[PDB]
Amino acid sequence: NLKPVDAMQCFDCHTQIEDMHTVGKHATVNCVHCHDATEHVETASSRRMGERPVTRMDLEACATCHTAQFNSFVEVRHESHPRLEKATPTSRSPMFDKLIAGHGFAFEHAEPRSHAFMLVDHFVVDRAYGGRFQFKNWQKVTDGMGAVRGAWTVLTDADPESSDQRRFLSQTATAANPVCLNCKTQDHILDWAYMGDEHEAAKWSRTSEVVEFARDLNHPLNCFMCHDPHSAGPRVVRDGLINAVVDRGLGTYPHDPVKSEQQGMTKVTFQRGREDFRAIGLLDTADSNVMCAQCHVEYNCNPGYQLSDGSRVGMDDRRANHFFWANVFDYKEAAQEIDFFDFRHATTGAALPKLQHPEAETFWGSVHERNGVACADCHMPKVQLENGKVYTSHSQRTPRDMMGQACLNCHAEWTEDQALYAIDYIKNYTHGKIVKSEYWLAKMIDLFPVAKRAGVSEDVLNQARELHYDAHLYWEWWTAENSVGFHNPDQARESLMTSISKSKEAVSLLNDAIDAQVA
Amino acid sequence: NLKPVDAMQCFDCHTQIEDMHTVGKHATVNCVHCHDATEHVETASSRRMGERPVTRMDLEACATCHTAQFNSFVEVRHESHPRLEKATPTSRSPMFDKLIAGHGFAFEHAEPRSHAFMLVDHFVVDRAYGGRFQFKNWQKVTDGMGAVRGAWTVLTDADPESSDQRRFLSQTATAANPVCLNCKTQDHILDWAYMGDEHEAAKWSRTSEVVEFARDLNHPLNCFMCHDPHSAGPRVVRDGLINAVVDRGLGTYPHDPVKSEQQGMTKVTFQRGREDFRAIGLLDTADSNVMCAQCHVEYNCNPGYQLSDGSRVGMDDRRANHFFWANVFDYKEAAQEIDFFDFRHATTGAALPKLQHPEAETFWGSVHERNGVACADCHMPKVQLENGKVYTSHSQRTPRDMMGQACLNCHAEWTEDQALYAIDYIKNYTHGKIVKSEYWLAKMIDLFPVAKRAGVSEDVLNQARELHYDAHLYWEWWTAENSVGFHNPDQARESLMTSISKSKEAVSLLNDAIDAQVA
Ligand code: HEC
Ligand code: HEC
Ligand code: HEC
Ligand code: HEC
Ligand code: HEC
Ligand code: HEC
Ligand code: HEC
Ligand code: HEC
Ligand code: HEC
Ligand code: HEC
Ligand code: HEC
Ligand code: HEC
Ligand code: HEC
Ligand code: HEC
Ligand SMILES: O=S([O-])[O-]
Ligand SMILES: O=S([O-])[O-]
Ligand SMILES: O=S([O-])[O-]
Ligand SMILES: [Ca+2]
Ligand SMILES: [Ca+2]
Ligand SMILES: [Ca+2]
Numbered sequence A, B: 001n002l003k004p005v006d007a008m009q010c011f012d013c014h015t016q017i018e019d020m021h022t023v024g025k026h027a028t029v030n031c032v033h034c035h036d037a038t039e040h041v042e043t044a045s046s047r048r049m050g051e052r053p054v055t056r057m058d059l060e061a062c063a064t065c066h067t068a069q070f071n072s073f074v075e076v077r078h079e080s081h082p083r084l085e086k087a088t089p090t091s092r093s094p095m096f097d098k099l100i101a102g103h104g105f106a107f108e109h110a111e112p113r114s115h116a117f118m119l120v121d122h123f124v125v126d127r128a129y130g131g132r133f134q135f136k137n138w139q140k141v142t143d144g145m146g147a148v149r150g151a152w153t154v155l156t157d158a159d160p161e162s163s164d165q166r167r168f169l170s171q172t173a174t175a176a177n178p179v180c181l182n183c184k185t186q187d188h189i190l191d192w193a194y195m196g197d198e199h200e201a202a203k204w205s206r207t208s209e210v211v212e213f214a215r216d217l218n219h220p221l222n223c224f225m226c227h228d229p230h231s232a233g234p235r236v237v238r239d240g241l242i243n244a245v246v247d248r249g250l251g252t253y254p255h256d257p258v259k260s261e262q263q264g265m266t267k268v269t270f271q272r273g274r275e276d277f278r279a280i281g282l283l284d285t286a287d288s289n290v291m292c293a294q295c296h297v298e299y300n301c302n303p304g305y306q307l308s309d310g311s312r313v314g315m316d317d318r319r320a321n322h323f324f325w326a327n328v329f330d331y332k333e334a335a336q337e338i339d340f341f342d343f344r345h346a347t348t349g350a351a352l353p354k355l356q357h358p359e360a361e362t363f364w365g366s367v368h369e370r371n372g373v374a375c376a377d378c379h380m381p382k383v384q385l386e387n388g389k390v391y392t393s394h395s396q397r398t399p400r401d402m403m404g405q406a407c408l409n410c411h412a413e414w415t416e417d418q419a420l421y422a423i424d425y426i427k428n429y430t431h432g433k434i435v436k437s438e439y440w441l442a443k444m445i446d447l448f449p450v451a452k453r454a455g456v457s458e459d460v461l462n463q464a465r466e467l468h469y470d471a472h473l474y475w476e477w478w479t480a481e482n483s484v485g486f487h488n489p490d491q492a493r494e495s496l497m498t499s500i501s502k503s504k505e506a507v508s509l510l511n512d513a514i515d516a517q518v519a
């Protein structure tokens, strides 16, 4: 059984923790629930750690007193189809392979599934580690609780004796790097300096061997990613988000200074050897928009190239860990600002961006966001009980599974079927425009080889490449973004029409140039 | 196809109809929809009818333009169990046979079923016509639409060549009389003088041969019982109700003079040969409490006896058609006022009242009634449509079948299961007290023969008989009333505790007297 330690001993050296812990809703929660610090207390000085205390980062450290939230979190939504490739006619991006040719996502890009699996899915996807990591057997794919207990309880490593990224299966890639892990786990929260910069006190950084780092990580979406363990107050821990909101002064709601001030973030820094080491962002309110924006954003978490001169931008560069914190119509400016692109298209030769799940930046400015609605209202609603203590569901999933608690709790004028119908109207319309956008992108792409064989000039091809950047951006945002337009229907529509317009312009340019060579 | 007639010609004679028809919501509805008056118009003067016009009383006369209301009305609720005797351990009054001994209801008293069957059920019940009338075969019991089209389409008469009330089956009674029919049909509305008094212009009256009257009647619960055909406005047609509310000055809400004034009734009289003949009661508002009180009340519709001297009160007496319009705690006084009782108990010799379905007089004073709730809010709610024109459901049935439209439309704090639970709490509690009241009544009744054999004095027996009147009244109200307390739980409780108290008093009186004879 646990035996409490004297927190006053700790508070002598840990004044920020004292301030947070004594004032918040965990003032009665003893340190032993999460730290084994006996040898540390015997050996530390005011400025030197001595022996490192052991800190629990498993989610069961919180389940101890918060079983309802834990159990809701670890539920597996079996209706969220697993390992479902997006580059298929029945999924989100039927022409993805042609359009993304040159990028690692061509090797595999599945739809998301339940949060329990985030770390294991990151480890096993064909694009990440060359097939090095696999489930121990095909039964383990169902085991959400097991994945939560730890990735290495359900996975195997093809070669524990080597730590290099390489291909073990032929049609895999090795895109994973240390920055990725920040959106899969925070088991490394005490071992990673802010932004992944090099730091004497950091075991891991942007430039680490990712296979070695992987082996040290266990748990998905730790509870403390949104809740400070010392104050129990709302927070974020993700460096890239704090960097956008606070360091760059963009605010929590970059389009609304008033809401940014009311629902702000305060950066708190922790030191090692009296040098800044790590940071968190305490929130003014329990604002799920900002909590979920730790991960559900467009980002760089990867090497790339400069738009200006094509030079390589490696993991050592700060730009390899970057939150753009820009809506679709501000993204090109944001990427030009940091002088960055992701890949060159394998057929067209265009420098292109790679977009990922920009839910937060899409939600901005929507009617829902402007009315003060937040992600949790639809995806983590309060549970309605005839008799009981209310709590917040932590099963982050589609509102279709809890329409009474989600949509219908605000939209009294609708039946469930009516609300579903409104969702589907938007998704169906948006998906139609995604498909048309892909049709036109593909038409343009297929003209590049014809133009090259016809002897069309490099000047014309470069004009078309510039159009490809925009055609790509204004399409891929929406295959990347998970709501199929629901989060911001008007923006999806305007963007996708812009994509089609750009592709059409490029098609006309290339066809005319080919015709003139003939011729 | 129907051809309209010149209504203006009719109006030269029919000035009350003109006033009603031209102002109301049937101003455009031509008389030919309900009257064949060709020969009448050729022969009438303002002072002499000439040939009698034919008036349609079938409900299909209204279904023509109001199919939704018709079709909801004629629905058969199959879950309303048919021909279910109440004098059984699993129904409303387990000890009914012992308690009602001496009354014709001992021959059969079933639970009510859907309105479509009211007239056929009246005709075929074992207590009514000596078994003379039966369904044509046992399949016809399902045929609600057929019953609505006409009773004689689904029934047979054992002897069309005689018109006397007699027993055709051994264990039947001949309780039916012309007054009954007024709560089953209004096909006779132009053939029956107000109250069923003798009248030169009336084909039928209280003293008619009921078997002959029966044969002239076809349709249940005619639509015009609640809606004036000429104005389309809300009304009642039941003589006994108009007599209580208007003639006797009791008002529509005897316990609330203000509500009586706001939701009142105006008596309109029609003449034959320039003598008053029939009447209707136009309502100030579409008040279902008063509409349903045409039938769902305690009444006399039967011969009986005088409390004063025991003499017979026959059908010729006005008291044979009487609405008491009194709550349970005013009923004894009301019966004393008219000097009337129904039967003498076969065992105890007590003069007793016979109570019938006093839903209207029970509902008075309930929290619901005091808050302006009316029968229709629970039993004829408005339909809820995602897309459509709202109308009022005319399927009068338990709110359990439409909880969203009924209870939950007002009680937002409850789920369906919670609202059902609240109903069942009241009904279970009330039924328990009904059963206990019957236990104590039966215990008292069973002492009467013992006391007689022991030589107990007639004075003591008469004291006990006076107690029996009250013990009976304060019990039977609640087996008669169909809500098992729900309509007024506090009143049910007080009454049933009074019944038990009276029976216990009689039991003590009789036991002590028997013991004194012995020991
Ligand atoms: C002064 C003699 C200390 C005592 C008493 C306690 N700690 Fe400590 N701790 C101390 C230092 C100088 C450091 C390095 C960081 C800094 O603030 O300079 C630490 C570090 C920790 C950590 C972080 C460990 C990691 O992996 O990075 C934890 C979780 C921690 N300390 C916990 C802790 C507890 C629970 C104590 C009371 C039982 C406690 N510390 C006492 C110095 C001192
Ligand atoms: C029992 C010994 C606890 C452990 C282990 C954890 N928490 Fe806790 N938590 C506990 C209490 C007694 C309370 C106060 C309850 C109240 O409503 O007063 C809390 C509260 C929280 C909250 C709510 C915070 C708020 O400001 O409203 C959160 C978000 C929370 N706790 C989270 C949390 C996490 C993430 C834990 C593991 C790191 C954890 N708690 C452990 C008791 C206990
Ligand atoms: C936070 C800014 C992220 C970074 C950094 C990385 N990922 Fe991610 N990932 C993130 C979210 C919010 C989601 C769910 C929404 C979605 O669109 O899928 C994901 C999902 C995955 C998955 C599962 C789906 C799939 O593509 O097969 C995998 C396998 C995955 N992510 C891998 C991965 C890699 C290899 C990364 C570094 C190159 C990486 N992620 C970074 C959020 C974030
Ligand atoms: C990074 C640590 C994350 C945070 C914080 C949040 N989400 Fe997430 N989400 C993330 C990943 C990597 C994935 C894919 C996991 C996989 O193994 O494929 C997801 C997935 C979702 C989903 C889809 C669930 C499904 O049933 O398919 C939803 C609805 C979702 N995420 C919502 C969501 C919300 C509302 C968040 C704030 C409360 C949130 N996520 C945080 C990564 C991370
Ligand atoms: C008994 C006759 C079986 C039937 C019927 C099904 N499965 Fe099975 N399965 C069985 C055994 C003995 C094993 C090996 C167990 C072990 O750990 O040694 C399995 C294995 C699987 C697996 C894993 C396959 C792999 O890793 O290559 C899966 C995914 C699986 N079983 C699923 C499964 C399904 C869905 C079934 C119905 C279609 C099914 N099994 C039937 C024995 C038996
Ligand atoms: C961000 C993606 C979250 C993660 C990770 C966890 N929780 Fe959470 N939690 C989150 C939100 C948006 C809310 C509601 C805030 C509001 O005020 O509306 C909560 C709430 C809690 C609470 C408070 C009680 C309640 O409302 O249920 C507790 C005790 C809590 N969360 C615990 C908890 C645990 C144990 C987690 C890991 C299983 C966990 N949270 C993760 C957002 C996020
Ligand atoms: C209700 C007004 C919403 C708010 C606020 C947010 N989301 Fe949403 N989201 C919503 C819908 C109707 C859908 C489509 C779901 C469907 O079943 O059709 C989504 C989808 C997502 C997904 C993918 C879920 C899946 O396909 O299973 C994710 C990952 C997601 N939403 C995330 C998310 C974030 C992070 C939000 C705040 C920035 C957010 N959503 C808000 C409805 C609503
Ligand atoms: C005066 C010359 C009349 C004309 C024109 C119409 N009616 Fe008549 N009607 C008239 C009399 C004197 C009576 C007897 C009752 C009375 O008010 O004294 C009637 C009666 C009726 C009835 C009732 C028949 C019954 O069964 O009792 C009806 C339904 C009726 N009248 C209808 C009617 C119609 C529709 C007419 C125009 C087509 C019409 N009447 C003309 C005198 C006169
Ligand atoms: C068509 C030729 C009709 C026949 C036959 C009947 N009714 Fe009618 N009714 C008709 C119309 C055009 C209207 C007006 C609708 C409106 O909202 O304006 C009505 C109205 C009624 C009403 C509502 C009256 C009110 O609120 O004041 C009722 C209760 C009604 N009608 C009843 C009714 C009865 C019982 C009928 C058979 C005797 C009947 N209607 C026939 C058209 C027609
Ligand atoms: C209106 C004041 C009524 C008079 C006059 C008669 N009945 Fe009736 N009856 C009435 C109602 C409101 C109900 C339904 C509620 C209930 O408690 O049953 C009934 C029901 C019947 C039934 C069906 C149930 C049964 O007892 O088997 C029958 C067979 C019946 N009524 C017969 C009947 C007889 C023979 C009457 C005159 C002696 C009589 N009823 C008059 C309302 C009214
Ligand atoms: C006399 C013409 C009636 C009027 C006016 C109303 N009701 Fe009635 N009701 C009546 C009878 C004779 C019966 C029994 C019919 C049978 O054949 O047994 C009934 C029955 C009911 C019921 C029970 C229906 C079931 O499914 O069992 C209910 C709920 C009911 N009645 C309600 C009711 C309401 C609310 C009325 C005003 C709108 C109303 N009735 C009028 C006789 C008559
Ligand atoms: C064919 C092999 C039959 C089976 C199976 C059932 N029934 Fe029947 N039933 C059948 C016939 C030929 C008749 C006579 C039809 C006629 O009008 O001549 C009947 C009659 C009935 C009746 C009426 C009985 C009577 O009036 O005495 C009823 C109530 C009835 N049937 C119901 C019924 C039920 C509920 C059945 C399944 C339990 C059933 N029948 C089966 C032929 C056949
Ligand atoms: C009394 C027991 C009724 C009988 C018999 C019929 N109806 Fe009725 N009707 C009744 C009520 C309580 C109401 C609602 C009044 C309100 O304003 O709340 C109605 C309403 C109508 C209407 C109006 C349109 C609507 O609300 O649906 C019509 C056209 C109507 N009723 C027609 C109608 C028909 C055709 C009937 C015989 C099948 C019938 N009603 C009988 C009460 C009573
Ligand atoms: C809701 C607040 C009601 C009002 C107003 C009226 N009644 Fe009612 N009634 C109500 C309930 C909950 C019940 C019990 C039904 C059950 O399923 O348990 C009843 C019952 C009846 C019945 C018998 C119905 C049956 O057993 O199927 C009748 C005939 C009845 N009620 C008639 C009636 C009258 C005439 C009303 C106005 C005077 C009246 N009810 C109002 C709920 C409500
Ligand atoms: O209290 S923290 O800064 O060690
Ligand atoms: O690869 S992750 O960003 O979806
Ligand atoms: O007999 S009738 O009144 O129920
Ligand atoms: Ca999914
Ligand atoms: Ca990106
Ligand atoms: Ca019934």
Ligand SMILES: [Ca+2]
Residues within 6 Å of the ligand: B298, B299, B300, B354, B355, B356
């Ligand atoms: Ca009576």
Ligand code: NA
Residues within 6 Å of the ligand: A079, A080, A081
């Ligand atoms: Na899905």
Ligand code: NA
Residues within 6 Å of the ligand: A371, A372, A373
């Ligand atoms: Na708002």
Ligand code: NA
Residues within 6 Å of the ligand: B079, B080, B081
């Ligand atoms: Na029933």
